[PDB]
């Protein structure tokens with residue numbers, strides 16, 4: 001029943017004052033995009049930065065199985081939009097937040113389907 | 116600032132290609148200088164963006180289900196910044212395959228790890244990008260001679276796996292070059308040596324073969340042409356610039372919907388070569404894409 005819970009171990013490392021995973025690939029874009037969380041092309045707006053998916057995936061960066069029965073990655077081959085205020089640690093941001101299935105935005109950082 | 120500072124880079128002028136210069140040491144006035152990049156942008160993101168900005172001005176064939184292979188996509192960082200720019204640049208649906216001698220994580224549809232000499236593929240490709248560079252090239256213990264290594268593989272790969280009408284972008288430097296590679300540029304409708312403005316302080320250049328004809332259009336001597344490239348770089352200092360990176364509005368490659376036909380040997384008349392030269396045609400099979408990596412087994 002064992003399994004390496006790398007998502008947890010990383011937060012415990014960030015709370016332990018650890019250095020966030022670097023070398024996340026920031027993309028050049030107009031910053032006039034939709035603002036959606038995970039897109040097929042950079043969609044950052046004036047308040048976000050677009051990054052290559054693979055570079056922001058904890059599982060891809062650490063060479064460990066993904067938490068999906070098949071082993072499919074939902075970031076690889078796509079672009080993740082990260083608020084400019086949290087762009088110093090994109091991997092940690094994608095682990096701590098979730099995407100709204102209705103508008104496709106970040107809950108608490110764009111999503112407003114509660115309005 | 117110069118007029119070409121607002122360009123993504125500079126292409127070797129035609130008059131330098133027609134000279135017969137002897138090989139001299141490359142001595143750039145600004146060698147070592149670093150360009151000022153936009154906040155948080157990696158050098159290879161800026162470099163691939165300017166390359167793609169320039170490729171947008173050429174007669175590239177861009178069909179549906181386009182096939183692109185990217186060699187030397189890894190980095191010491193463990194990520195593939197160049198593959199990220201290509202993914203951004205190529206139309207949705209484009210098949211992107213990358214490879215490198217060292218392990219790395221990529222946004223490519225499929226990644227192969229190992230010497231490029233162990234990579235095999237049943238099908239042809241529409242575009243080939245090589246950023247391969249052997250670090251041992253830094254040890255200059257003798258005359259700058261034509262290099263073997265991956266260049267031998269690349270020359271064979273272009274001749275057997277590049278679709279007619281297809282294009283290539285191969286990275287070279289003063290000492291990382293191959294004479295047979297320059298000779299192949301003559302097998303394309305048009306070619307050039309392109310220098311990005313963000314890395315103008317380097318002897319680095321991307322040899323660009325535009326629209327492969329499968330047959331020589333002009334006779335090129337690689338030893339003479341590489342000497343011509345050095346003469347150009349030595350006599351034309353290029354101002355470092357990242358200006359082209361601030362306008363990303365027209366960046367994505369337009370899907371021309373170039374026709375893909377499976378014509379055979381002996382059906383290639385003059386009209387076909389004319390359409391190939393303008394990127395209006397791609398000649399190759401449209402079968403499933405299969406790639407493999409040889410695995411040597413020892414004790």
Ligand SMILES: C[n+]1cn([C@@H]2O[C@H](COP(=O)(O)OP(=O)(O)OP(=O)(O)OC[C@H]3O[C@@H](n4cnc5c(N)ncnc54)[C@H](O)[C@@H]3O)[C@@H](O)[C@H]2O)c2nc(N)[nH]c(=O)c21
Nearest residue numbers: 141142143146248250252253255288289290291317318319
């Ligand atoms: C052009 N040039 C070359 N040299 C000398 O000749 C050697 C070999 O020359 P080169 O063919 O490597 O060319 P250059 O120095 O222009 O290459 P540069 O370092 O800019 O690297 C070009 C690209 O290759 C790749 N690359 C370079 N080094 C490595 C590496 N170790 N591993 C992987 N990729 C690498 C990178 O993508 C990099 O941007 C140099 O290390 C230097 O002593 C020069 N010396 C002076 N004083 N002035 C020059 O103008 C000059």
Ligand SMILES: C[n+]1cn([C@@H]2O[C@H](COP(=O)(O)OP(=O)(O)O)[C@@H](O)[C@H]2O)c2nc(N)[nH]c(=O)c21
Nearest residue numbers: 129172173174175304305306325326392393394
């Ligand atoms: C950029 N480019 C240059 N050529 C050829 O080279 C010639 C000179 O083009 P150039 O040297 O880029 O200068 P220009 O600004 O005066 O056009 C063209 O008229 C073409 O014959 C080209 N030929 C093809 N097939 N494709 C290209 O992308 C291409």
Ligand SMILES: C[S@@+](CC[C@H](N)C(=O)[O-])C[C@H]1O[C@@H](n2cnc3c(N)ncnc32)[C@H](O)[C@@H]1O
Nearest residue numbers: 159187189190196197215216230231246247248
């Ligand atoms: C300039 S680095 C590539 C940088 C990459 N394009 C990027 O976006 O950051 C050159 C790469 O060539 C690779 N390389 C060198 N010789 C090779 C060979 N024979 N086969 C495959 N890859 C090779 C090295 O492993 C190295 O990662």
Ligand SMILES: [Zn+2]
Nearest residue numbers: 057059060073
């Ligand atoms: Zn992943």
Ligand SMILES: [Zn+2]
Nearest residue numbers: 100103111113
């Ligand atoms: Zn929502």
